[PDB]
Design an enzyme around this catalytic site. Structure first.
Site, PDB file in Angstrom:
ATOM      1  N   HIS B  41       0.807  -1.214   0.000  1.00  0.00           N
ATOM      2  CA  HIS B  41       0.000   0.000   0.000  1.00  0.00           C
ATOM      3  C   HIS B  41       0.844   1.270   0.000  1.00  0.00           C
ATOM      4  CE1 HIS B  41       0.819   1.089   4.158  1.00  0.00           C
ATOM      5  NE2 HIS B  41       0.493  -0.127   4.557  1.00  0.00           N
ATOM      6  N   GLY B 143       3.762   6.219  10.501  1.00  0.00           N
ATOM      7  CA  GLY B 143       5.097   6.007   9.986  1.00  0.00           C
ATOM      8  C   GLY B 143       5.733   4.696  10.381  1.00  0.00           C
ATOM      9  N   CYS B 145       4.478   1.605   9.482  1.00  0.00           N
ATOM     10  CA  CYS B 145       4.211   0.548   8.516  1.00  0.00           C
ATOM     11  C   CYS B 145       5.515   0.054   7.904  1.00  0.00           C
ATOM     12  CB  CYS B 145       3.269   1.052   7.423  1.00  0.00           C
ATOM     13  SG  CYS B 145       1.572   1.338   7.979  1.00  0.00           S
TER      14      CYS B 145
END
Ligand SMILES: *[C]([O])C1=NC2=N(C(=O)[C]1)C([C])=[C]S2
Ligand SMILES: [Cl-]
Ligand code: NA
Lengths: 301, 304
Positions: B41, B143, B145
């Site tokens: 993503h 932040g 991920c």
């Protein structure tokens, strides 16, 4: 989102852990630049626990009496000296993995990460806090001596603790990296009891402020209190006295949430009075006291 | 003595974290050999995440649209491909700090360490347990991920988790390193909720053995039980059913302390029904279920 007792990334400290052997005793040493720091009771034999004369024991030592092992490589000891309760072994090779570092002596209530080590190789990492009785509630087994506690601010590692001994109550005592013990303890196997442990009140208050920032307000009330009236109540629950310094430290968290410090203090007075009544705060059924105001403002933005 | 939520030493994983940027979205990536792994993503904008077509977005992108940063050195992407929900970015240089590693998928109830990172920079490490609802109770701000979960056996790092998203109840969802999600979740901005969780019974039992090893013995009693009788009590308090394999796994702890599993289940059965009565176990007012039997043995034996 989430409030977990997070430890610092241990990579910069793993690269400094070595094995120090003297006679039949093996513990951990901290290899920074060309110096290896380790507890001085590594030079103790079975007859030396109770009344060690470290100067008498050390003057009988040569450099080759100390076997320093970094991984599979043997380091050559070219010098040795004693600074309080830590041994400083000068080695022939500078640690190429030496990070930006400094030595800092911390105060009760301050938190830090511990890299549990055995035979110079790391076992695990966990977060600790210096208890008001100058002990730490860590996880240490036989051979963990020389394990270090540290904080990492940016890329600078502030070493603040070195493990030396476990007390009879299961808590642990150690020194700073200059050899000075935390509290009244000594590297002797005689009777030395830790003082009655209390709750770090300034850490509970910052942890309650974090709960308000994270959307938990069920514990708030509309009462305030004076600083003296709170300390009169808090002492009855074995809580540490709250000082004016603690009030100023909580200043930013108070302005962020809009709740005055003495307003949060009255909320803590009621929580001690009522308990939790089946409820939880930030996932805990007890009042957490191992998050400093610095940890809260950083972790909760 | 002492018992603490202990994480693995994160040094071997710190040397693999990089920063991956696609447009204005930056997150963490795992750099192993000449491949950087990160959530897929990363190639989505605020409108793409509403209902993304990842193969459509990927075939539009090329190597130059991916900005990989290892510390202060930029990495040149020379190839991109997808495997389930992770993006595999081939780079020109192999990571010199690549450790001996494996891609494994873990079972619900097993534990692992998480290296929380922000823009490729590791900021914290902590120990998780994969909940029966396939979520984890982590601490992931924006932040994070691309942060990975891992176990270390000897010198080999077993990567099991990659963080993908946060759920509205504060819990987190992710995939294994092959892109396969943990639990009934998808990587897109929709109404997703974690199912009703349960307590890992075998982990609570191992944590009671850890308290007995540590001198906390007030909860022991003279009674024992059977697996079927205890499972009746476990289901009543939303506890995972205790299988016979769970009893065998607790074998070494039952031999080190002398308390049989069914003997300890009698203690657990009494704590579920009558509570702790103002007392604590290892400094906790609730039953801890994020220590596997192997975690208890490892911490109470000094495996490095
Ligand atoms: C030194 O190394 C030491 N440390 C510790 N311990 C012992 O024995 C020794 C314990 C038991 C805890 S900590
Ligand atoms: Cl301090
Ligand atoms: Na029993």
């Amino acid at each position: 989102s989430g409030f977990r007792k997070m430890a610092f990334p241990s990579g910069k400290v793993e690269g400094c852990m070595v094995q120090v052997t003297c006679g039949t005793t093996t513990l951990n040493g901290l290899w920074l630049d060309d110096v290896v720091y380790c507890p001085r009771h590594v030079i103790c034999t079975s007859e030396d626990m109770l009344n060690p004369n470290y100067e008498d024991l050390l003057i009988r030592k040569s450099n080759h009496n100390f076997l320093v092992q970094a991984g599979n490589v043997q380091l050559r000891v070219i010098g040795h000296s004693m600074q309080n309760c830590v041994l400083k072994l000068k080695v022939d090779t500078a640690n190429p993995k030496t990070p930006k570092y400094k030595f800092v002596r911390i105060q009760p209530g301050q938190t830090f990460s511990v890299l549990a080590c055995y035979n110079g190789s790391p076992s695990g990492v966990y977060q600790c806090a210096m208890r008001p009785n100058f002990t730490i509630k860590g996880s240490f087994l036989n051979g963990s001596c020389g394990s270090v506690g540290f904080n990492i601010d940016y890329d600078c590692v502030s070493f603040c603790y070195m493990h030396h001994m476990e007390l009879p109550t299961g808590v642990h005592a150690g020194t700073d990296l200059e050899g000075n013990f935390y509290g009244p303890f000594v590297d002797r196997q005689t009777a030395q009891a830790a003082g009655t442990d209390t709750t770090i009140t300034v850490n509970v208050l910052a942890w309650l402020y974090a709960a308000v920032i994270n959307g938990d307000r069920w514990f708030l009330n509309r009462f305030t209190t004076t600083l003296n009236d709170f300390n009169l109540v808090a002492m009855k629950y074995n809580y540490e006295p709250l000082t004016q310094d603690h009030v100023d430290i909580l200043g930013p968290l108070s302005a962020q949430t809009g709740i005055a410090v003495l307003d949060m203090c009255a909320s803590l007075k009621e929580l001690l009075q009522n308990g939790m009544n089946g409820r939880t705060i930030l996932g805990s059924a007890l009042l957490e006291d191992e998050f400093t105001p610095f940890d809260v403002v950083r972790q909760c933005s």
